[PDB]
C-alpha cells in the first residue's frame, strides 16, 4: 500500500526534477530547425507517415 505510493512519488518527482534541467540546457525559441515568423508558421500533427513532402505541400498550399 505504501511501497507503491513511495515508488509512485519518486517517478513523479524524478521527472519533475529532470524537467528543470532540460529547460535550462535547451531553449525552445533558440532552435535552428525553427525559422520564420512565429505568427506565420503553422503546426500540423497526426499526419500519416506515408505522406510525401509534395503531398503535404499541395494539400496545405490551397
Amino acid at each position: 500500500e505504501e511501497r507503491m505510493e513511495r515508488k509512485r512519488r519518486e517517478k513523479i518527482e524524478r521527472r519533475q526534477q529532470e524537467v528543470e534541467t532540460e529547460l535550462k540546457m535547451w531553449d525552445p525559441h533558440n532552435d535552428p530547425n525553427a525559422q520564420g515568423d512565429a505568427f506565420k508558421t503553422l503546426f500540423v500533427a497526426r499526419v500519416n507517415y506515408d505522406t510525401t513532402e509534395s503531398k503535404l505541400r499541395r494539400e496545405f498550399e490551397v
Binding site: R58, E59, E61, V62
Partner: protein, 48 residues
C-alpha cells in the same frame, strides 16, 4: 493596374483602387466549403 479607379459619389465618394493580385493553385470547393486541391485527373473525370 491599367484599369481606372472608379470614383463614384452621390457628398461621400469612393475610388476602389486595386494594387496587387495573387493566383493560388487550382482548387475545388465542395458543398461543405472545405478547400481541397483538385488534380487534372479528377477534373477530366468529374467534368470539372
Amino acid at each position: 493596374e491599367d484599369a481606372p479607379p472608379i470614383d463614384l459619389q452621390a457628398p461621400p465618394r469612393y475610388l476602389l483602387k486595386f494594387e496587387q493580385i495573387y493566383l493560388s493553385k487550382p482548387t475545388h470547393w465542395e458543398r461543405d466549403g472545405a478547400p481541397s486541391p483538385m488534380m487534372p485527373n479528377e477534373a477530366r473525370l468529374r467534368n470539372l
